[PDB]
């Protein structure tokens, strides 16, 4: 479980998600999952966000049991400052 404070840039936040209610990235599991950390991007520069991490929440917006479009909205309707709640698998 982690906190990631980030600054979105030219290429966005610099990573790609999957999952959510009705679009299960793993069977019987609607979590949002980071699937691709973009080379030389804000997250890749920050270095915390790893592949297979679970976005629990984005600033104030909780991504637990949300639709994919709901998740992507939340990650796309955000200023240059974004806080992230993630869960690092173990």
């Amino acid at each position: 479980i982690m906190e990631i404070k980030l600054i979105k840039g030219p290429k966005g936040l610099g990573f790609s998600i999957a999952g959510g209610v009705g679009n299960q990235h793993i069977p019987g599991d609607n979590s949002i999952y980071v699937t691709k950390i973009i080379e030389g991007g804000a997250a890749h520069k920050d270095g915390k966000l790893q592949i297979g991490d679970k976005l629990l929440a984005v600033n104030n917006v909780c991504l637990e049991e949300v639709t994919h479009e709901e998740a992507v909205t939340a990650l796309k309707n955000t200023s240059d400052f974004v806080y992230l709640k993630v869960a690092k698998p173990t």
Binding site: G12, L13, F15, H25, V72
Partner: peptide, 4 residues
């Protein structure tokens, strides 16, 4: 799947 979706880039942000």
């Amino acid at each position: 799947e979706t880039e942000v």
